[PDB]
Design a protein around this ligand. Sequence first.
Ligand SMILES: C[C@@H]1O[C@@H](O)[C@@H](O)[C@H](O)[C@@H]1O[C@@H]1O[C@H](CO)[C@H](O)[C@H](O)[C@H]1O
Ligand SMILES: C[C@@H]1O[C@@H](O)[C@@H](O)[C@H](O)[C@@H]1O[C@@H]1O[C@H](CO)[C@H](O)[C@H](O)[C@H]1O
Ligand SMILES: [Mg+2]
Ligand SMILES: [Mg+2]
Ligand SMILES: [Mg+2]
Lengths: 141, 140
Amino acid sequence: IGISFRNEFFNPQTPVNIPVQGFSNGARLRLVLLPTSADSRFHINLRTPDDIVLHFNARFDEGAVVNNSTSGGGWQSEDRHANPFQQNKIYTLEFVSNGGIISIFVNGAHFADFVERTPSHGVHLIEIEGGVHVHSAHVSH
Amino acid sequence: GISFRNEFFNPQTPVNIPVQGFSNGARLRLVLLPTSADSRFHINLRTPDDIVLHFNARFDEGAVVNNSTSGGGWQSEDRHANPFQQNKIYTLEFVSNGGIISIFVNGAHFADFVERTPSHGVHLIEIEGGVHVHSAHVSH
Ligand SMILES: C[C@@H]1O[C@@H](O)[C@@H](O)[C@H](O)[C@@H]1O[C@@H]1O[C@H](CO)[C@H](O)[C@H](O)[C@H]1O
Ligand SMILES: C[C@@H]1O[C@@H](O)[C@@H](O)[C@H](O)[C@@H]1O[C@@H]1O[C@H](CO)[C@H](O)[C@H](O)[C@H]1O
Ligand SMILES: [Mg+2]
Ligand SMILES: [Mg+2]
Ligand SMILES: [Mg+2]
């Protein structure tokens, strides 16, 4: 398992599954991504050992982003947003976690807030799956 | 394969740390406690072909010796006083400055080491010998 002096990795293979030491107190995850036509959805999960704190799901089949989470392994209430992505275009997607709110930006502009339902301090894994190519992934605490 | 856990605690010696991104400004910070288990310990910063810096604390000789390899053979030593005592805690930091690695102990400059081969491609840190590692941290 390799680490980086800049906490950044290029061209990781999907599905990407990357350990992280919590995701709170101002942690930022920056992804440069290209949604693909290989699947009609892709998602990013910020997972603790027990639950998903945030599941961010881009859905080209439904024309939406769906955010949700699990508690005791069951899905909670969905937040639905417009889909800010187009397949085969490049996006910089950032998540920023502080004070129980995970703020989400696309190409530098605020896209949505997610009010977490389980503490993001317990996050231990960043998972990226589905119809998406990850060009780069970076975490700053 | 890859991890954003750039700081970790209490790894067992010997520690093998696969790394990338050792460029100008990169900093390795270790909190260590030398032990009586062996009269020496060392830190190697390696590329896939050579040791860029072998930092070796020696309680038997009363010195730190720095060196490097070319084609697997040792080059010329730099020898310094030993700043460490067994069973005391030290923060040891190595900073790449794009050709000179600057080494600090407890926040004070200890020594510079002039690289004998470029270190851009350092891919592996090893920590071995009579030392307990409380933490390792890579950053800029
Ligand atoms: C299970 C429901 O089925 C579909 O028709 C969706 O429109 C709903 O959102 C549900 O899908 C599930 O939604 C969760 C998040 O709430 C996950 O995205 C899961 O992958 C998806 O199957
Ligand atoms: C082989 C030499 O043995 C003693 O004379 C030491 O005082 C010298 O420093 C040499 O020791 C070797 O030094 C290299 C670095 O030049 C490595 O530390 C190696 O482990 C050590 O045996
Ligand atoms: Mg399919
Ligand atoms: Mg500089
Ligand atoms: Mg400089």
